[PDB]
Structure formats: C-alpha cells, structure tokens
Structure 1
Amino acid sequence: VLSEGEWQLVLHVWAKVEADVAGHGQDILIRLFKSHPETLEKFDCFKHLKTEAEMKASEDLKKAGVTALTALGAILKKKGHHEAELKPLAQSAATKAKIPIKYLEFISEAIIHVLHSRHPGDFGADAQGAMNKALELFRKDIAAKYKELGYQG
C-alpha cells in the first residue's frame, strides 16, 4: 500500500521524467539491456541493435522508450485507481507480446536505477521505496489480467 504522501513522492519525481521523456527512456532501456542482455532477443523491433552506441543512436529505441514511459506515467497518475487504463494494455500485452512478464521486474529495476542516477535530490530512500511499491503494484495488476486469460500461467 502507498500512502498518499508516497504517491506524491512518485508524482513529484515523475514530473522530472516528463521534462525529458525521450532521454529517460533511452537511459532506462539501455540500462535494461546492459543489465539483462538476454532480454534484447525478444524485442523484435530492436533486432538490428547490438551495441550501446547503436542503441544510443536508434530512433526505434528512443520512440519505444517514449511510448513505454507515456503509458506508465498515465497509470502512475491514477494512484492505484487504474483499472480502465490498465486492462486494455495488459490484455493486449498478453495476446500480442510473448515477452516474458518477468521482464517487467527488470525494467522496473532499470527505472529505479536511472531515477536515482539523474534525480538524487528527489529520489531518496522514501521516494525509492514509494516508486518500488508503485511499480510492484503495477506488475501485480498486469499479472492479474494475464492470469485471467491464462497467459503466463
């Protein structure tokens, strides 16, 4: 459970993400693929990307980071009351991605790393705990929609 104070920590640092969504998205996806290079194989649209330099120069990767953070930010702003926004996203993910759902845990760690790296003054221990809870709630609710239809179950 997030307190309302914790939701406000989440939204306060998210405002800093929104000041440079593309840059945060590049940093997060590159961190994901350096920490878990085994995940890159499952991103069909990145089949041409192998090196950090190639990822930093990729418009496909930059656009994908923007799309991911755009949808994540819209869900975070609902402060847990995200059924209407989450259900179509999760059900489409379940029937169109066949990217393992455990990869959401890896990208969550990448988000926390990047936010701490870029915004330490606004991402201390309390804000990191709040963001960790918010992304865990998101992942659990996505898994719930997957399990409804039987995917990743």
Structure 2
Amino acid sequence: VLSEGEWQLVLHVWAKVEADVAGHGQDILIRLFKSHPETLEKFDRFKHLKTEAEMKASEDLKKHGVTVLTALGAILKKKGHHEAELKPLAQSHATKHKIPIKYLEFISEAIIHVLHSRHPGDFGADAQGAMNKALELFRKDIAAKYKELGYQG
C-alpha cells in the first residue's frame, strides 16, 4: 500500500502528464514498440508501422495513446480503490487481447522512462519510487484477476 505522501507524489506528476496527454501517450507507446518489438504484434491496428517516423506520423496511434493514459489516470486517481475500473480492463486484456502480465511490466518501464524525460524537476528519485510502487500495485491487482480467469502468464 502506498502512503498518502507517496500518492501525492504520484498525482502531482500525473497532473503534469495531463497537460499533454496525447504527446505523452505517443512517446510511451513508441518506446514500448521499439524496446519490445513483440508487443507491436499484439496490435492488428498498428502492425503495419515499421519505423519510428511512421509511428510518430500516425494519428490513430496518438488517439490510442490518449485512450491508454486516460484509463490509467482514472485508476491512479482512485488511490488503490480501483476495483470497478480495473476489472473490465483485466478481463479484456486477458481474454480478448491476450496480453501477458510481462507486457504490463514493459509498458510500466516505458511510462517511467517517459516521465523522466519530460519532467526531471517533478520526477526525482522519490517520485520515481512512488510511481513504481503505484504501477506494481496496478500489476499485482491485474495479475490476481488473470489467475482467477486462468491466464496467470
């Protein structure tokens, strides 16, 4: 569980992410795709993209970035009480998209990398630690739903 002071560090940087949801969303997905090419293969709608320049140019990819970050933001603002928000997400990612838990660890790394690039002053070590904990909490709860359904993995 995160303390109230750790949640404050998380939401303070998130308010910054919200000033440019689309730019952040795009940097995160591109970092994920370049760092872990096997993840791009799960998206039939983005599979045709080969270069970083093509990725940057895709308006649809940018629109999906907003989708992801808006859902994540709704979760973070619940400060751990995210049952109603996390459940639909785990069911679709487990049974429809077939996303292994390890891929959620990859996107978490991408999120941390991008927040660091874009917000050094509001993203020092302490904030980085709180963010990691929040993303771990997210993964832990998702993993529990996956197991129940028979997808732990």
CA displacement 1:49-88 (0-9 Å, x = unmatched): 1100010001121111110000000000000011111111
Q: How far apart, CA to CA, are the structure 2 residues paired with 1:44 and 1:57?
A: 17
- Report the CA distance between 1:130 and its aligned residue: 0.3
Unmatched tracts of structure 1, length 5 or more: none
TM-score normalised per structure 2: 0.96
Percent identity for Structure 1 against Structure 2: 97
Contact 2:9 2:127 in 1 (8 A): yes
Q: Work out the CA distance in 2 between the residues paired with 1:39 and 1:88.
A: 21
Q: Map Cα deviations across residues 92-147 of structure 1 (whole Å, 9 max, x no partner).
A: 22121012221110010000000011000000000000000000100110111111
- Structure 2 unaligned regions, length at least 5: none
CA distance in 1, matches of 2:74, 2:144: 19
Residues 94 and 100 in structure 2, CA contact (< 8 A), matched pair in contact too: no
What secondary structure is seen at the aligned counterpart in 2 of 1:99? Answer: coil
* Partner Cα separation in structure 2 for residue 6 and residue 152 of structure 1: 28
Q: Give the Cα–Cα distance (whole angstroms) in 2 for the partners of residues 111 and 141 of structure 1.
A: 18
Q: How many Å separate the matches in 1 of 2:101 and 2:18? A: 25
Could you list the per-position Cα deviations for residues 23-48 of structure 1 after superposition, in whole angstroms to 9, with x for gaps in the alignment? 00011011111111222112111021
For 1:88 and 1:34, locate their aligned partners in 2 and report how far apart those are by CA, in whole Å. 28
Between 1:49-58 and 1:83-92, the stretch displaced more is: 83-92
Name the counterpart of 1:122. 122
Residues 48 and 67 of structure 1: is their aligned pair in 2 closer, same or farther, counting only changes over 3 Å? same
Say if 2:32 and 2:107, in contact at 8 Å, map to a contact too: yes
Counterpart for residue 131 of structure 1 = 131
Distance 1:68 1:100 in 2: 17
Question: How large is the Cα RMSD of the aligned pairs?
Answer: 1.0
**C-alpha separation in 2, matches of 1:94 and 1:85:** 15
Secondary structure in structure 1 of the residue aligned to 2:2: coil
Separation (CA, whole Å) in 2 of partners of 1:9 and 1:101:
25
